[PDB]
Amino acid sequence: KIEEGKLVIWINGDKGYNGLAEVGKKFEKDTGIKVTVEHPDKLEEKFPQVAATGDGPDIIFWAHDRFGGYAQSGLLAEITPDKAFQDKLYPFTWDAVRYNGKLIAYPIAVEALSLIYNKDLLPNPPKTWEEIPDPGKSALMFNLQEPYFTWPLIAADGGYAFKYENGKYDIKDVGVDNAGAKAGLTFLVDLIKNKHMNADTDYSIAEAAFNKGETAMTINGPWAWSNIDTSKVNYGVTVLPTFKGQPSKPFVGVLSAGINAASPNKELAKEFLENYLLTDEGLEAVNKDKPLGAVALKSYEEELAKDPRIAATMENAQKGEIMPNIPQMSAFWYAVRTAVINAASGRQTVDEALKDAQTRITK
């Protein structure tokens, strides 16, 4: 319903929207242009619905994987920073938001899942996945409803999204049905079957458990840290357990800011991002609300790199793989989500599930 003269930003609920709003207020003072920060439910799936008929927000925040599918539908505007601006952010972060030669977004931060453990309850964290299942429910709790959390275990011994080869992603070469993904999932289902974990554990349940001091371990991102801080739990962040000597390989996501192609405030959006958001102060404001992880801007990243928790995020990142941004990621996530959920709940076996996932992605 139009939108000229003001900015409407969409960012997920788990990130620093109040922090981003302080940035909005700084822009506002100087420019006179109102900045509105919203966090709707399932904005990543809702963007395409609204953006298609020239609606929605001016700017959108999300991990880079969804962006390539957005780019291909003609929903994003081309971002055009000069080469001097480009030199401020790490080159690999620019590579993430590069679709078909064109920059479709500004890189903000690098996110990776880590092992979060209660130091008072468990002073020394388990080095392997196989030493977790012990006698009773005594174990870890993490979101099992979102494929993003169980991925690290599945990829650990061989699973892969899309075969990466010669710069291209073999879309017809999906690897969720090999023996590495089958072992990862069988291990997870065995945890559930042997009752050390519940199949309905979601984000909120898992978070509550750890913040209330009911669980000694959990798996989460840099955005989770704020909640644990206020909860007063003595926690440490470290590397993901190994599975059969192989490190867990988490999917590396780059929080990105894309600009709607229907937005009449294209230059206002551009000015907010380069002059206000992507500065030391800009990123500091958002980081205070809920941590971002490893930031794209070198200057602020250099200060942030000595923090022990960021160090662990990075180690997990370099042992993982950057997510593909192509348009086949959307269907990839539904296939894996359905596969993990079915298998854990007893709808079908590990072999049945994964085969179906493969088949639906390779169609």
Ligand SMILES: OC[C@H]1O[C@H](O[C@H]2[C@H](O)[C@@H](O)[C@@H](O)O[C@@H]2CO)[C@H](O)[C@@H](O)[C@@H]1O
């Ligand atoms: O579970 C699949 C889901 O994974 C990623 O979503 C992450 C997101 O990037 C993180 O920043 C954080 O919000 O949590 C999400 C997990 O619920 C992908 O970005 C997303 O496309 C995909 O659906």
